[PDB]
Design an enzyme around this catalytic site. Structure first.
Site, PDB file in Angstrom:
ATOM      1  N   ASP A   1      -1.542   1.945  -2.144  1.00 42.64           N
ATOM      2  CA  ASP A   1      -0.856   0.669  -2.041  1.00 42.64           C
ATOM      3  C   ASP A   1       0.450   0.590  -2.813  1.00 42.64           C
ATOM      4  O   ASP A   1       0.682   1.331  -3.741  1.00 42.64           O
ATOM      5  CB  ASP A   1      -1.766  -0.456  -2.555  1.00 42.64           C
TER       6      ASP A   1
ATOM      7  N   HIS B   1      -3.349   3.758  -5.948  1.00 42.69           N
ATOM      8  CA  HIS B   1      -1.970   3.282  -6.020  1.00 42.69           C
ATOM      9  C   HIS B   1      -1.005   4.443  -6.307  1.00 42.69           C
ATOM     10  O   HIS B   1      -1.059   5.039  -7.372  1.00 42.69           O
ATOM     11  CB  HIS B   1      -1.852   2.183  -7.080  1.00 42.69           C
TER      12      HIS B   1
HETATM   13 ZN    ZN Z   1      -1.276  -4.270  -4.175  1.00 39.92          ZN
END
Ligand code: ZN
Ligand code: AHL
Ligand code: ZN
Ligand code: ZN
Ligand code: ZN
Lengths: 206, 206, 206, 206
Positions: free
Chosen positions: D9, D163
């Site tokens: 993300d 992430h």
């Molecule tokens: Zn996010």
């Protein structure tokens, strides 16, 4: 022991004496939840209900939904209605019957105030549904209400709701007293020492 | 002898077709109380409900407590709702389901008007609480909404309050249908010929 | 090694003592985030949470979103809350639990000020949703609330959010205790020296 | 049957080319959910991600909880982000990944708009917890991170939240990438005509 707790709401009324006579012949004890203004207007019948072996409980002053629950006056009206009855029978009842049952009107806050003021709350296990037959030919209505009641009488303890301000209800109590006596029931009044919870909230503090 | 009346409120809506298919597959009939705004927006869904064997009743224009009860627009708004529904299905239905329930809003004034207008008022005897379960996985919410309904069906006639405008509600309907069936209910719809009163004011005129 | 962190918010209150007993019976330790007004009213309950092995954290004074976040009084309020609690239990707790959670109230400026003041911030990883279940029989709500927590415990550390100011909430905890323990969780309180981050902003300075 | 859907993300970012090199080195296919402004800044990385056989999906423009959910902008920001990506890879992705997950941000209303606007929604089944270790020694941080992931891999399909704007997340990937090959797993990217539901709402229209 299978006990049947007949309970009577919104009294006293003009059929109440009729009902007290009917109950006495059957050696049956009952509970009355009286409205404030009816206590003022029928002090005799109130004294008589106590005198004849029946529990006398409260059912508030206004029987108005917005005052009792929305504006949180429940406990206050039960207390004032407690005074009026105490003035007649010489003891202060603890058992209240909420107008319209307790669900959902008696929220968590008010349920605290009831416990904090000494009161118990009794809803019911059977709705005789006697209001449906209002202003109808009493004879036929009453036997139907007896059906409503007799055919839901299942568990050992049963708290039955009736309104002795209505003729068809009072007329029904004959036939309910026979058919319940058949299925092994006994007709006792509510005793304050023998309290057990009966409330839609399953709230055992009441 | 047992009959369950599923009633769905505030519709029609985007889930309503899905609920209509579920009803049909299970050979079950229900009752719909519609907001006029949705009557207008989804006129084909109204038409299909009536066409599939369901009752189509009114649930006002505005669903606004103040306008309905404080201002006394209840009967107006239900007749506007009535008119709109007639244009689509050819019937002027008489049953109304009051927004937020009849108690405390439908006072004696409005209740008289309701009767003088020839309308009927249905509340409910089981509140699924379906619309509250809106902050959880839909399937889990539907399980709890069925559980509510299933464990409160006790009477030979239950008027189950739901809302077809929420996903968790329509998702809950199959478990509900299956459960009551094992308990012995049929899922008939409301018939005007066979009206028996169901309000909170115990007013058997409506 | 799995650990459930039961957290109770908005207390202390009239069911906090009952909950304190029930924790004791199961040797379980928990965490209480308190409102200052309640801390002032129930000082002895605060002392009892502490004296029994529970962490006593802050949950502001006003629980007022606009005052806390739009106005930025968050750190002020948690500091005054800290002061009040210390006077009772002797230590200045560091952990705060934001009313309405940190997202999106705890903006970056406020998050900086949180860190400058030496405070920690906890949101939670499981919402019991307990306080929403206030319109049903309390046993029933409690069983649904237990179901919620039990079916959402899957991660080695779970922070369960509850409120001890509601009857159904405190009634849910026994079934929550048994269940999570079946799944091999033990119930610790929060430990200052063992802090790990748990917040919606993924800010590991809190 | 074994499948591991690595998802990353908030990209692209500084370590994305490193990550993309690491995946290629292992013949691994992944999924990226890109923020709008990062797409503007890193057109090549966006182009390269699609070109090397990974899925590229949206993760909003603002990544802002109050705009997306409270102010209902979710779908608009997803459509806008979608445009940015189409202008680079020559198609319009359907899969969105909600900032902060969909629970409770994406209410029933927004879940309709997402269904209607043509979008799907994937949450995850494994939180890497990678954000905990930010600004900590990348070595140890990464090793811990592979652990959180590998540990909870047990179901036939897994959707892992990572992430790629974080150094420790990237460094953790080699250890994950064949922590999971042994357990059986194969590392496929998401493909739209192969869509299956993975959302906290269990909303299967998504
Ligand atoms: Zn996010
Ligand atoms: N804010 C509320 N929804 N009030 C609670 C009762 C609503 C009522 N069942 C009704 O309007 N059904 O359609
Ligand atoms: Zn009454
Ligand atoms: Zn309504
Ligand atoms: Zn709170």
């Amino acid at each position: 022991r299978k006990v049947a707790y007949l309970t009577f709401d919104d009294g006293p009324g003009k059929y109440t004496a009729e009902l007290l006579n009917t109950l006495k012949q059957h050696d049956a004890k009952a509970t009355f939840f009286l409205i404030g203004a009816n206590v003022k207007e029928f002090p005799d019948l109130v004294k008589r209900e106590n005198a004849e072996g029946h529990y006398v409980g409260m059912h508030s002053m206004t029987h108005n939904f917005a005052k009792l629950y929305k504006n949180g006056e429940y406990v206050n009206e039960m207390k004032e209605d407690q005074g009026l009855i105490a003035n007649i029978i010489g003891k202060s009842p603890k058992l209240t019957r909420p107008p319209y049952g307790s669900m959902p009107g008696l929220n968590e806050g008010l349920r605290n105030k009831v416990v904090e003021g000494g009161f118990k709350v009794w809803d019911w296990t059977i709705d005789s549904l006697d209001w449906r037959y209002n202003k109808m030919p009493v004879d036929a209505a009453a036997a139907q209400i007896a059906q409503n009641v007799l055919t839901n009488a299942t568990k050992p303890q049963e708290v039955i709701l009736m309104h002795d301000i209505h003729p068809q209800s009072v007329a029904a109590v004959p036939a309910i007293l026979k058919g319940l006596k058949e299925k092994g029931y006994e007709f006792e009044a509510y005793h304050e020492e023998s309290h057990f919870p009966v409330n839609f909230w399953h709230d055992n503090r009441m």
